[PDB]
Structure 1
Amino acid sequence: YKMPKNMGVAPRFDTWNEKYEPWEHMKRMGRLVGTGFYIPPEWYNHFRMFPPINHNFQQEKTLNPHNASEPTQD
């Protein structure tokens, strides 16, 4: 049984985005700082009061090409 060469290291083509999505780091860093035991990085000091946009969702979870996901990149 022959496969395409690099399938061992093949990335998850649906979920590989999640890790890097801004909201994630907002939440995590949110409850990390909350402890009192972490010094907030300054980006968090900033986006604290300008949290990112709500309804932009990737094309992986929403399966539509026609959905214009981005207010910016449109």
Structure 2
Amino acid sequence: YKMPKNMGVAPRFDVWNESYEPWQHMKRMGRLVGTGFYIPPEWYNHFRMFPPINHNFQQEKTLNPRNES
């Protein structure tokens, strides 16, 4: 049964981004650093004051291509 050659290690094409969204690292570093047992990276010291924009959802979840995300 012939499946795609490299299929076995294909990425999950809808949830492969979400690990990387800046909001995930904001949510995930906010607590890592709130614990008080961590020394926040220099990018957190900044993108804490300037958190990313709110409504830049990826087309993989907003299933709408005509959408200027």
Q: TM-score, normalised by structure 2?
A: 0.93
Report the alpha carbon displacement of residue 11 of structure 1 after superposing the two structures with TM. Answer: 0.7
Q: Secondary structure of 2:28's match? A: helix
For residues 38-60 of structure 1, the C-alpha deviation after alignment (integer angstroms, 9 at most, x for no partner) is 01111000111100000010010
Gapped runs of 5+ residues in structure 1?
Answer: 68-72
Aligned residues: 69
CA distance in 2, matches of 1:4, 1:62: 28
What root-mean-square deviation, in Å, do the aligned CA atoms of Structure 1 and Structure 2 show?
A: 1.5
For residues 16-74 of structure 1, the C-alpha deviation after alignment (integer angstroms, 9 at most, x for no partner) is 0011100000011000000111011110001111000000100100111110xxxxx88
* Deviation beyond 2 Å, 4+ runs, structure 1: none
Q: Secondary structure of 1:28's match? A: helix
Gapped runs of 5+ residues in structure 2?
Answer: none
Identity of aligned residues (%): 91
Report the alpha carbon displacement of residue 4 of structure 1 after superposing the two structures with TM. Answer: 1.2
